[PDB]
Design an enzyme around this catalytic site. Structure first.
Site, short mmCIF file in Angstrom:
data_model
loop_
_atom_site.label_atom_id
_atom_site.label_comp_id
_atom_site.label_asym_id
_atom_site.label_seq_id
_atom_site.Cartn_x
_atom_site.Cartn_y
_atom_site.Cartn_z
N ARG A 152 0.85 -1.18 0.00
CA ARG A 152 0.00 0.00 0.00
C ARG A 152 0.90 1.24 0.00
O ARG A 152 1.86 1.32 0.76
CB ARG A 152 -0.94 0.00 1.21
CG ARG A 152 -1.54 1.36 1.52
CD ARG A 152 -2.64 1.32 2.58
NE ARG A 152 -2.72 2.64 3.20
CZ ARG A 152 -3.14 3.73 2.57
NH1 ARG A 152 -3.56 3.64 1.31
NH2 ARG A 152 -3.15 4.90 3.19
N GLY A 159 0.26 5.21 0.37
CA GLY A 159 -0.78 6.20 0.61
C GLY A 159 -0.27 7.41 1.35
O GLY A 159 0.93 7.64 1.45
N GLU A 192 -3.96 6.36 8.98
CA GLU A 192 -4.60 6.15 7.69
C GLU A 192 -5.81 5.23 7.91
O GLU A 192 -6.38 5.23 9.01
CB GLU A 192 -3.59 5.63 6.65
CG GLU A 192 -2.61 4.59 7.16
CD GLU A 192 -3.24 3.20 7.22
OE1 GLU A 192 -3.30 2.52 6.17
OE2 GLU A 192 -3.69 2.80 8.31
N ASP A 208 -0.36 15.70 6.42
CA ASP A 208 -0.76 16.75 7.36
C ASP A 208 -0.62 16.35 8.82
O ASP A 208 -0.41 15.18 9.16
CB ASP A 208 -2.19 17.20 7.06
CG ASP A 208 -3.20 16.09 7.24
OD1 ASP A 208 -3.46 15.71 8.39
OD2 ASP A 208 -3.73 15.61 6.21
#
Lengths: 237, 225, 227, 237, 230, 237
Positions: free
Chosen positions: C87, C89, C179, C204
């Site tokens: 993954r 992300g 996440e 962020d």
């Protein structure tokens, strides 16, 4: 023998006193039992068998925490013919009128452990002592002229808890002493069909911050031992 | 001193190896360390400090189960300046290809304990080792001619399971070994900001035990560079 | 074909990179892969296969959340021969000293989802990555001059969580990134016998180095694993 | 008055016997007490006050289930000065040689209810009786020549269980009787600072399927009432 | 007969109205039913059978709390052929615009009880009423010119809750009424394949008026049965 | 715009139909809406707005699973003025009498997700639809000569479940259809103060083994959309 006890059936009495500290077990054996002999030292978890006023009696450490004492109590019951276990421990107090060195008798034991939920389909199992053993302790203490309160203990998994507020809840519900074993031993006793009782000596107070030394915990809490041993004699009548 | 450790700051190295058996700790101290000194004997939970190839190292028993080892590891971290803890223990295997005497390194530790749920608002905390320590242990083993298996342990509260339901589930989800501590030590390390690792030998052999201790000690030296 | 992937055995490489966004998968394929072809478009969940430095590689969106990525990863492993899932992300940081665009590698993933408890008889399954994959990614990152942070992710079920105070708990226990997938993917990997890894870039800070770099790390990490 | 009891301070004695069945309460009042007067009829939950061998005593139904008895016992403790509650109930037996009409004393009560978890931060609260009340009941039973086993009850939320396998687990862990209230009452006693005991009579056997009639439960379980009343007299001493 | 109901198949109608208070069951039988006959008095939990506008109807107390009403509803369904149960009870309000005497219809029931988790392998069982019954109730209220809200109730285990803060959570989530039964009744209905509905009147916000309001609820319930027969 | 929706206030109607598959949203827009225009394509999650019988209506994919749909429905509610959400999806059946192609309306939605527990202090939140929307949907279906079942859905986190036994439990308590979103959408609607409904067509069966044609499925799909759209018009009245 069993995985954590290098002994054979007959080496233990049918009644075993068990502090968490194997060094306290040693002190008890040397102080209270005649003709004491060491019957276990696997992992340094000292156990002894002797006689007290003619009655064969054993005393052995169970280590700290529910998982540790669950191992030894199971082993004693399935393999050494042990019928009664008397935990003789230390605990922290939360109640204002509970004093350092007070003796408390755990008729029940609350817990934040998951072990009894694992046993009991995720419901609330009331981890309780054997009634006659509780009454024998109470009567032994009265004969000895030693005060003792009977009620709930709390068996904690984390001695250093992140949730300080739980002590407020314990106090609200009248918990007499905070230790780390009673509920586990009571669960084992129920699972394997034996009888158990936890007696504790208040070794520290959570609100007043008073405490005893490691040395004091190891050897000086003798009131509870006298109560334990004499309660056994009452039990035999 | 603490209620469970009769020592003072400085008595322990900043790295502590911890078997469950305090008699094993004594064996390690006498076998692998120079100038070994007993620095704790409260509750008979023997602890020692000495040197390994000139590096200050301590070894002390942690006792059986999460609640026992949680006490010792917390106190070492918060009161004795301990930075790294390496559990060195035994485990029972669950997988077919995980052979007896295999060395397993617990990058993660599952558990049926409630302690991490108490810490983590009843959510799933992944109790994990410190990665650099895992890498150090893998590299130390390779240098010694050993392929350690790296993966999940399962830390049980009940050595004697009431029903044994979990064994098949552990096998199903690829758990390498069952023991009774790693998840607790990892929770403590996370709570108090230290680093921990659990290494075990598959017991269900004095050579492989020595091998594991050599791995642990040599991994520390790697970490120091 | 599987219920969510209209492709056949062979269409996917044995390693699949997966962003949440299928359009990000499209971008990765066009930017990084040679001779890339589209191999899936069911539900708009774009998947592609091509080569990276001669190595056959796939990239495909997994959608948002544990339930979504659990579907796609399972089908890939059980029906398309996929051995490794990576993954790639973004995540939110809760720790002060974790910086925007830091790269985080999820050696473990915490979660508030119930999926692993369902798998694991209501106990704590430690949802972890494959060690070799983690190490490959660390090494690939270092080669590029990036010091990736290695530790726990937290995989949330609620992007809009009603429990702000849980973020403090995450911070206290050293969570590197937040996440919505890692723990689910890791549960699937354990359940079906495969290997997985989650790499994230910090986009962020929750409460009061480029994306291409991350992709390069993931792809180069595969090449290291091959060796 | 309180929301569920239309009476005033002094209308109740400081000890209250409570069956779940208000018609049993009425039978007990008419049969064991002298000068009994009805003190509550709100919702048909009959409560009475009279004397037993000169001692002021009350008896009042608590209804079926933890939520029902929790209401009444709370209101009695906080608003009518009640110090002791003795539940006098019926229960189903799971153990092989626990028979119909046996008397069982709940020193503890397991439960599948969530109420104590709500009280105790989702940990295990050991729902226990007051020890002295337990001992008084044991002593009264002995004096009366009535057998009575002491141990764990299980307070169920669902009389009609979807999960039949739970009975096997109760049996395994030595549960003496399955009823629907003890753990709730013990939780109220702890929360509001009073003392409680549950005594039950086995009214059916979960395995053999032996069972008593509704009339038998209402008006023939007298051994447990004798024990309860005599135990209060012991406690006063 | 059952351990809690001294009666036989046929003694009950296939629709039963149930307040918590057996005395209110007696009031309903005496007030709105014709030819009413007492058909249960075990534990003083009065039950009656009569007719309303020619339709056979039963009314019986269910006592307080999920465990209590669960016993009665189960036995009515499995042993007495009861098809529909309508709880007619009181509740406490937590929402600003919900006033004393307002009629709330529980299309759903939240709860802090464990009973449905026991049924449903520790997952979330949405305890819901039968849709037709909810609709019949809404339509009857309209016909009677009585306003009603349809939404979630909260079925509490503890009338005296240690958790004061939960009422804020109920409010946040639009809970119309707090009572002690609906979620349990709905679980029973699902377990044994019957249909149920809970209607309540707000009796508290957390005489002759209460009468009129209670009567209003009873009229909605009875009239909704007639609609359901059509 | 919001983080997952690149549109402005007014781009969406106050009612949004939502299938899981964004390609189905496109199909719906092309098949049922006049003057349809695409108003979102972030993450390929296609959304459209147009008119139906002169009424402004939107349709947008929500992706698969509670976490995905929770993001979209939240953002529509807080930032696009959306008052009503109608999920139009497919579901699996567990009850033998529930047939392939049946139309199921989820007045409630059970779930194995933890999201509502997180919202509701670990208690049981009954995830429900808006009553008027359920009724509007039943009436619209009647007018179209379609008999829709109304009851519980089950929203699963795992399309590939390891727990096969849960389906038996679902069947036991009368669950009409298994899908992956309803309970999350209802949780969001309650949290952020909007109204929602989930309609599904039964597309497969866990217990039975009929098999339909694509032609039949498209007809049934279309039927469900007509029901949703007509239900909105009924609600406007």
């Amino acid at each position: 023998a069993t995985p954590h006890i290098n002994a054979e059936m007959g080496d233990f009495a049918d009644v075993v006193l068990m502090p968490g500290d194997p060094l306290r077990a040693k002190y008890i054996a040397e102080t209270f039992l005649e003709d004491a002999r060491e019957v276990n030292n696997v992992r340094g978890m000292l156990g002894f068998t002797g006689t007290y006023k003619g009655r064969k009696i054993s005393v052995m450490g169970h280590g700290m925490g529910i998982p540790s004492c669950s191992i030894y109590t199971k082993e004693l019951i399935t393999d050494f013919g042990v019928k009664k276990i008397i935990r003789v421990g230390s605990c922290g107090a939360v109640l204002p009128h509970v004093k350092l060195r007070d003796v408390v008798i755990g008729m029940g034991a609350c817990t934040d452990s998951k072990v009894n939920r694992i046993r009991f389909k995720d419901h609330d199992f009331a981890a309780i002592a054997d009634f006659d053993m509780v009454r024998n302790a109470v009567d032994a203490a009265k004969a000895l002229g030693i005060d003792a309160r009977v009620g709930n203990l709390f068996s904690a998994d984390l001695f250093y808890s992140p949730d300080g507020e739980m002590f407020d809840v314990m106090e609200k519900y009248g918990i007499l002493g905070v230790e780390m074993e009673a509920a586990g031993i009571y669960g084992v006793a129920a699972e394997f069909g034996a009888k158990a009782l936890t007696i504790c000596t208040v070794s520290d107070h959570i609100r007043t911050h008073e405490q005893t030394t490691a040395a004091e915990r190891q050897t000086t809490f003798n009131d509870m031992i006298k109560i334990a041993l004499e309660s056994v004699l009452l039990g035999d009548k």
